[PDB]
């Protein structure tokens, strides 16, 4: 009848198939949630090994061919990009929402009603979080940032070492603070260079009070330590001058050939001398330097670095007050380099880190920068440490930008579930059921946390729900909103007192994104798959 060259699935079949795909994706990463979560080891069929706990990384490395599972994978990626934390939680929440919504649909509830109920429940959950479950960081201080970083680094390879790593993260984040127009303090994370080098234990990871370059000096004749550095940042190669494509040398009188050939290098010699005459000590260029200019720098006792990465050069110039110079050409048509275009630093060295060397620009002036050198046991450990450190940096950035945090350890989900279960009775007749199922789906996070610890999930979650119900019913027992899960003892605990914090934006964005994904998938009721 249709005569379409492909396969078709319609009705309960396609809905159940989509639910199965989403559930499989959720089950892939469900075991890496919470402090008692465990990492995974991915082998990339050519021997490459990736050991990670981050949900986004696991979902990107996996190759998936079911489009709903692809939707969840891109959901995790979006949560990573926009927030940086909660990548596993959003996937799990979306999958549970899809499961419960599909159960409602199988109960002959129209999917439009389920979608409307989910939208209302998400709006009310965000409103309730913003109105009741937020804690201002003004009355906490640096301890709040430390606790947020420690909570973020739980369930990571650096979790036990939080007492040290949280201090490192907070110092690094505060060291790059800059205020823009409108007086808004913004923290440009990803300006903190993360360098990985195996060797000593994690305790020997260093926080550079400056910038760290994964580069060395181009010539062994140059000094490897300069005290009062005058950094000159350039964006052009220092090589023998070659004329452009449109210029061709034609010789009729041979007497000029030697002059031509000599000028070919004298041009670059003059440029080097002009740069050096201003007292420059360190020269960084994104382009290459040939042996001639390297010797020019050697004779002057000046450090010269070639093939510097553009982002590293930009960060160094911004921190040290230097200016990138793609060319030496002023507005008078001449070719000059003035000393005002030079950055400064208190020391530039080339240190040795486990049989290799890297350049440290210590204590730059006119702006403070930061870099972190992570020391591990092997490459995989250092990579996972870098991923966890990035998660912590993003969490600290979110906390410092928006000064609201919410209690962790499943407290928010339990409070939201109780509130939404109560609130659904005042809305609609079938969207009532949809909101109730949204509330029930929100409880998957504490259940997974308890299960990962091999604890009594049913009783522990029941006690959490009882505590939050008492908090929401008795007006004078509102201090129980902070009661979450203490996985070490398997007992409810005041997580706000215990210092288990996390940014509000994580929960808000995760809820919004999960609702979007569940609505998108739940809308499908027919699939046509054309043969390739």
């Amino acid at each position: 009848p249709l005569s379409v060259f492909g396969d078709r699935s319609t009705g309960e079949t396609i809905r159940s198939q989509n639910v199965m795909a989403a559930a499989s994706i959720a089950n892939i990463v469900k075991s890496s949630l919470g402090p008692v979560g465990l990492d995974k080891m991915l082998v990339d069929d050519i021997g490459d090994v990736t050991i990670t706990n981050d949900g986004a990384t696991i979902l990107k490395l996996l190759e998936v061919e079911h489009p709903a599972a692809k939707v969840l994978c891109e959901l995790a990626d979006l949560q990573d990009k926009e927030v940086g934390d909660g990548t596993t939680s959003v996937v799990i929440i979306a999958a549970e929402l899809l499961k419960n919504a599909d159960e409602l649909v199988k109960q002959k509830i129209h999917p439009t009603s389920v979608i409307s109920g989910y939208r209302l429940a998400c709006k009310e959950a965000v409103r309730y979080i913003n109105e009741n479950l937020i804690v201002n960081t003004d009355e906490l201080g640096r301890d709040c940032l430390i606790n947020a970083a420690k909570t973020s680094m739980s369930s990571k390879i650096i979790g036990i070492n939080g007492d040290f790593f949280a201090n490192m993260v907070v110092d690094a984040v505060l060291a790059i603070k800059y205020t823009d127009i409108r007086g808004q303090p913004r923290y440009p994370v990803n300006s903190v260079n993360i360098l990985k080098a195996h060797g000593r234990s994690q305790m020997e990871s260093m926080l550079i009070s400056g910038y760290a370059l994964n580069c060395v000096v181009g010539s062994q004749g140059m000094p490897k330590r300069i005290v009062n550095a005058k950094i000159a940042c350039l964006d052009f190669s220092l090589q023998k001058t070659k004329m452009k494509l449109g210029v061709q040398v034609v010789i009729t009188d041979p007497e000029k050939l030697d002059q031509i050939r000599q000028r070919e290098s004298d041009i670059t010699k003059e440029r080097i001398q002009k740069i050096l005459a201003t007292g420059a000590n360190v020269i960084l260029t994104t382009g290459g330097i040939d042996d001639m200019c390297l010797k020019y720098f050697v004779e002057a006792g000046a450090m010269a670095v070639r093939r510097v990465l553009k982002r590293d050069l930009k960060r160094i110039a911004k921190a040290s007050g230097a200016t990138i110079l793609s060319t030496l050409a002023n507005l008078e048509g001449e070719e000059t380099f003035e000393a005002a275009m030079l950055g400064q630093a208190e020391e530039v060295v080339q240190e040795r880190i486990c049989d290799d060397e890297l350049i440290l620009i210590k204590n730059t002036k006119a702006r403070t920068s930061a870099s972190i050198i992570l020391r591990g046991a092997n490459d995989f450990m250092c990579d996972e440490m870098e991923r966890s450190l990035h998660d912590a940096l993003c969490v600290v950035k979110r906390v410092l930008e928006s000064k609201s945090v919410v209690p962790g350890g499943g407290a928010v989900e339990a409070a939201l579930s109780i509130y939404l279960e109560n609130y659904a009775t005042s809305m609609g007749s079938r969207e009532q059921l949809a909101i109730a199922e949204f509330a029930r789906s929100l409880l998957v996070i504490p259940n997974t946390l308890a299960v990962n610890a091999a604890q009594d999930s049913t009783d522990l979650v029941a006690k959490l729900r009882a505590f939050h119900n008492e908090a929401q019913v008795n007006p004078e027992r509102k201090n129980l909103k902070w009661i979450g899960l203490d996985l070490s003892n398997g007992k409810p605990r005041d997580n706000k007192q215990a210092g288990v914090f996390e940014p509000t934006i994580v929960k808000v964005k995760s809820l919004k994104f999960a609702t979007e994904a569940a609505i998108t998938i739940l809308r499908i009721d027919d699939l046509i798959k054309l043969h390739p």
Binding site: Q107, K108, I109, N447, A450, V451, S457, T458, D459, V461
Partner: protein, 528 residues
């Protein structure tokens, strides 16, 4: 893992353990239940299954559908087995057992995913099932009058309820009356072999008849059979197990003669043996001769000459039914053919039924057997008619054993669910969740009824729950009016043992499925 130079088990062994395999088992049970989901209720639909040979089986019976499905999943086979068990012990409710077991497993799947110990779930199922069975026995309606009219009406109503889901539901009153008559005239053991089921192609469903006696197809008549009269008004029937034809006296017999007179004497002696058997049969006064063994052409012509009727190679079951109806005895020897061992019927007649000839024995006053002759337009039509009639017959037999009925249409299960929820609201709370899940699972049957009928299941379920909460034990789904009604007053009756066995089997299946934690599958041997 590692190669382990010498491996422990044989290569190719598949192992699966933990929560994931239990979840997979539950999912497989759901898949099996989906195969018979739409066959339940007066609005249920049949399923067509084609085997490898190409033969198609069309059925509404859950047990038949599950048997025709070639299930190889170890956990899913439990539902097929419990369907067979319900069919064997009760005869009806083979869809309800599978739906209930799958719903139990589905309801407890979320708790299994949280790591709840399976022993707790098993204990909760056992407690809930014991309570439900006790409640069914307690509230089942029985009448202690032993009134013939009331008993007949109860049997008819139970048969109609058991029949109002099959393709013969249009003639459910007709077939219920037939089934009740047949079972009542069965004597004391209600043996199913004493109810003949003959399928004849052609004719309407209403053309089907129940014979107050025995009827069987014509069996390969010899020459001279058409000269025998085909109607008698008070025949005496000789039920024999005898080969009435010229043949070797015995397999190892061997005749040795050396004289032509002895040769002729031997020939005449064989002829005289046959004629002596025939004369002994004839002088008994019988007019109809039935044998389990072949009756030759010589005997056929001999009986035709005497205005007698003969039919050899009668199937053994048909002779047993003829013996139980006419009231004679099967004789392997004709030396003593007295009046005691001769059957008697009011009228014997051979008539044409749709291109086939049948022999009819009617007017038996003390017959302990029947013969259903079913008409229809196709082989599968008669097959499904026979299956439906078998369901009705088993229900009527069980109701004969005990007249303990419960209103159907989901009313009994809604009452059980209300009772179980009330009980669960008064216990500590670990078992409360599981017993509540059991009570909620008991709602699958009315929900499936509404879904099959095209209703809105949620509204009907809410109305039923409210009605049962505020009083009224026998309120169930009214399919025709798309509402709820007192199904006891609507004569939607079910023997209580049907629901009792359904709950018992479903609970046992769920407990067995939940109890398994590891599945080990050995490699195939002699794959060929």
């Amino acid at each position: 893992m590692m190669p382990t130079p010498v491996i422990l088990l044989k290569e190719g062994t598949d192992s699966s353990q933990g929560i994931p395999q239990l979840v997979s088992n539950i999912s497989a049970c759901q898949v099996i239940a989906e195969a018979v989901r739409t066959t339940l209720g007066p609005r249920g639909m049949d399923k067509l299954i084609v085997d490898g040979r190409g033969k198609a089986t069309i059925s509404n019976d859950g047990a038949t559908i599950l048997k025709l499905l070639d299930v190889v999943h170890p956990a899913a086979k439990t539902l097929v087995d419990i369907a067979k068990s319900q069919d064997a012990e009760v005869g009806d409710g083979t869809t309800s057992v599978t739906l209930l077991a799958a719903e139990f497993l589905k309801q407890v799947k979320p708790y299994v995913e949280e790591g709840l110990h399976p022993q707790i779930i098993i204990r909760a199922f056992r407690t809930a099932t014991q309570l439900a069975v006790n409640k069914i026995k307690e509230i089942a309606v029985t009448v202690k009058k032993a009134d013939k009219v009331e008993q007949r009406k109860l049997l008819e109503k139970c048969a109609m309820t058991a029949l109002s889901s099959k393709l013969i539901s249009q003639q459910k009153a007709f077939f219920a009356k037939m089934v009740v008559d047949a079972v009542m005239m069965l004597d004391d053991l209600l043996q199913l072999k004493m109810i003949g089921i003959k399928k004849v192609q052609g004719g309407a469903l209403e053309d089907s008849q129940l014979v107050a006696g025995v009827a069987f197809k014509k069996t390969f008549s010899y020459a001279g059979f058409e000269m025998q009269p085909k109607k008698y008004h008070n025949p005496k029937i000789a039920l024999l197990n005898v080969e009435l034809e010229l043949k070797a006296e015995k397999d190892n017999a061997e005749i040795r003669v050396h004289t032509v007179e002895d040769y002729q004497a031997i020939v005449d002696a064989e002829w005289n043996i046959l004629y002596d058997k025939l004369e002994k049969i004839h002088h008994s006064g019988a007019k109809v001769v039935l044998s389990k063994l072949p009756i030759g052409d010589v005997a056929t012509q001999y009986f035709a000459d005497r205005d007698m009727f003969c039919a050899g190679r009668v199937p053994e079951e048909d002779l047993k039914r003829t013996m139980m109806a006419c009231g004679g005895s099967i004789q392997t020897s004709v030396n003593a053919l007295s009046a005691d061992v001769l059957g008697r019927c009011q009228v014997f007649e051979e008539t044409q039924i749709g291109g086939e000839r049948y022999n009819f024995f009617t007017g038996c006053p003390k017959a302990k057997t029947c013969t259903f002759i079913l008409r229809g337009g196709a082989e599968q039509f008669m097959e499904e008619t026979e299956r439906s009639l078998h369901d009705a017959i088993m229900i009527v037999r069980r109701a004969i054993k005990n007249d303990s009925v419960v209103a159907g249409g989901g009313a009994i299960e809604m009452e059980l669910s209300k009772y179980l929820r009330d009980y669960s609201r008064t216990i500590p709370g670990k078992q409360q969740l599981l017993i509540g899940a059991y009570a909620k699972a008991l709602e699958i049957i009315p929900r499936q009824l509404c879904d099959n009928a095209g209703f809105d299941a949620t509204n009907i379920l809410n109305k039923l729950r409210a009605r049962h909460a505020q009083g009224g034990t026998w309120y169930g789904v009214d399919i025709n009016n798309e509402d709820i009604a007192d199904n006891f007053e609507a004569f939607v009756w079910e023997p209580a043992m049907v629901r009792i066995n359904a709950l018992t089997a479903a609970s046992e299946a769920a407990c067995l499925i939940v109890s398994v934690d590891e599945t080990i599958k050995n490699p195939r041997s002699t794959v060929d």
